[PDB]
Design a protein around this motif. Structure first.
Motif, mmCIF file in Angstrom:
data_model
loop_
_atom_site.group_PDB
_atom_site.id
_atom_site.type_symbol
_atom_site.label_atom_id
_atom_site.label_comp_id
_atom_site.label_asym_id
_atom_site.label_seq_id
_atom_site.Cartn_x
_atom_site.Cartn_y
_atom_site.Cartn_z
ATOM 1 N N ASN A 119 0.817 -1.203 0.000
ATOM 2 C CA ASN A 119 0.000 0.000 0.000
ATOM 3 C C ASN A 119 0.854 1.258 0.000
ATOM 4 O O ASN A 119 1.336 1.673 1.058
ATOM 5 C CB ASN A 119 -0.934 0.002 1.205
ATOM 6 N N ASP B 170 0.720 4.731 -0.277
ATOM 7 C CA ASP B 170 0.542 5.822 0.671
ATOM 8 C C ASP B 170 -0.877 5.927 1.217
ATOM 9 O O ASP B 170 -1.127 6.746 2.105
ATOM 10 C CB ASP B 170 0.934 7.144 0.008
ATOM 11 N N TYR B 171 -1.803 5.116 0.725
ATOM 12 C CA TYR B 171 -3.215 5.355 0.963
ATOM 13 C C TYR B 171 -3.708 4.618 2.205
ATOM 14 O O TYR B 171 -2.931 4.164 3.049
ATOM 15 C CB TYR B 171 -4.039 4.938 -0.248
ATOM 16 N N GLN B 172 -5.038 4.534 2.315
ATOM 17 C CA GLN B 172 -5.719 3.762 3.359
ATOM 18 C C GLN B 172 -5.277 4.230 4.739
ATOM 19 O O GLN B 172 -5.131 3.444 5.674
ATOM 20 C CB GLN B 172 -5.489 2.262 3.185
ATOM 21 N N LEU C 198 -1.687 14.135 -3.107
ATOM 22 C CA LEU C 198 -1.241 13.736 -1.775
ATOM 23 C C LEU C 198 0.024 14.492 -1.412
ATOM 24 O O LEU C 198 1.031 14.399 -2.118
ATOM 25 C CB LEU C 198 -0.978 12.236 -1.695
#
Lengths: 48, 268
Positions: free
Chosen positions: A40, A42-44, B150
């Motif tokens: 993963n 950078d998310y969640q 981001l």
């Protein structure tokens, strides 16, 4: 060549002494490892 | 004598009235490569001489490719004329080149590795000049949270230009943004569009006209400092622009910043 034998033209390394009492064979060579990792990026995660 | 304190000035409608101006012409390559001579400059010189213009007053600085000419266009000369060789595939760059070198941009530099920024008015733009600019922008809501991008890394923003040498972004006013470029490649400066520049006249030799200087969609004006002519032999283009160079010169005017009276008014 095996002394005191009747068979001619013998090949292949022996099970007798493959090392001759000497040390392990050393080889320096590269290796590629292409694989589908689970990761993963950078998310969640909390957006704060 | 009394400078920088803008005081009214009395004229009149009661009295009727009965050289040092230096043309400074630029030109692209394939023209030259087709001219097939090294004296053409001298012919232009002697012609201007017969027209009333001194010898040694006209200089020819040459630009190689349009994208090459985009960097650092310090066109310092008494009167400037730019003949651009049109492209049917390189358009936006011509439009923005016109925009830049026909207006006056007063800009301050930035350090995007540290500071947030935000545009102020419909007259505030971000010019970006250099070798190979790849802008990376990331808009923010009111308390610095990524929107569509981001901020915990760099490679997930929304790029607005790639493989460009000179590009002038305009951003939604009143919102902060994160920014990235390679600050060893090219540089971005935050410019305020102070007022029109009058030292330059740009004429295009090629296809149809595309020129607009306002990044406003509604207002796409046709100024006078933007002219267009056709061509099939560059010789006639040069000869002709010298045939009417009188009218061209009468159209432009002295740079309203270097007049010895523009003192303390932004560059003098």
């Amino acid at each position: 060549k095996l002394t005191r034998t009747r068979l001619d033209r013998l090949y292949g390394l022996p099970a007798a002494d493959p090392n001759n009492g000497k040390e392990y064979y050393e080889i320096a060579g590269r290796f590629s490892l292409i694989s589908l990792v689970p990761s993963n990026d950078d998310y969640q995660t909390p957006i704060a | 004598q009394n400078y920088g304190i803008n005081l009214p000035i009395t004229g009149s409608m009661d009295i009727a009235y009965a050289l040092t101006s230096t043309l400074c012409l630029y030109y692209p390559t394939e023209a030259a490569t087709e001219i097939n001579d090294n004296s053409w400059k001298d012919t232009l010189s002697q012609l201007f001489l017969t027209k009333g213009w001194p010898t040694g007053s006209v200089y020819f600085k040459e630009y190689t490719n349009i994208a090459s000419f985009s960097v650092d266009p310090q066109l310092y000369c008494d009167y400037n004329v730019v003949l651009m060789k049109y492209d049917a595939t390189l358009q936006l760059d011509m439009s923005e080149l016109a925009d830049l070198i026909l207006n006056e941009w007063l800009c301050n530099p930035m350090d995007i590795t540290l500071y947030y920024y935000q545009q102020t008015d419909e007259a505030n733009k971000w010019i970006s000049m250099g070798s190979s600019c790849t802008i990376k922008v990331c808009p923010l809501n009111t308390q610095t949270l990524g929107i569509g991008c981001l901020t915990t890394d760099a490679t997930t923003f929304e790029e607005v230009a790639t493989a460009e040498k000179l590009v002038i972004t305009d951003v939604v006013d009143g919102v902060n943004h994160k920014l990235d470029v390679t600050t060893a490649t090219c540089t971005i400066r935050n410019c305020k569009k102070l007022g029109p520049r009058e030292n330059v006249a740009v004429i295009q030799v090629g296809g149809s006209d595309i020129l607009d200087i306002t990044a406003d969609p509604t207002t796409a004006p046709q100024t006078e400092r933007m002219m267009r002519i056709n061509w099939k032999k560059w010789w006639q283009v040069f000869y002709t622009v010298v045939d009417y160079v009188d009218q061209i010169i009468q159209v432009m005017s002295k740079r309203s910043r270097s007049l010895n009276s523009a003192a303390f008014y932004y560059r003098v």
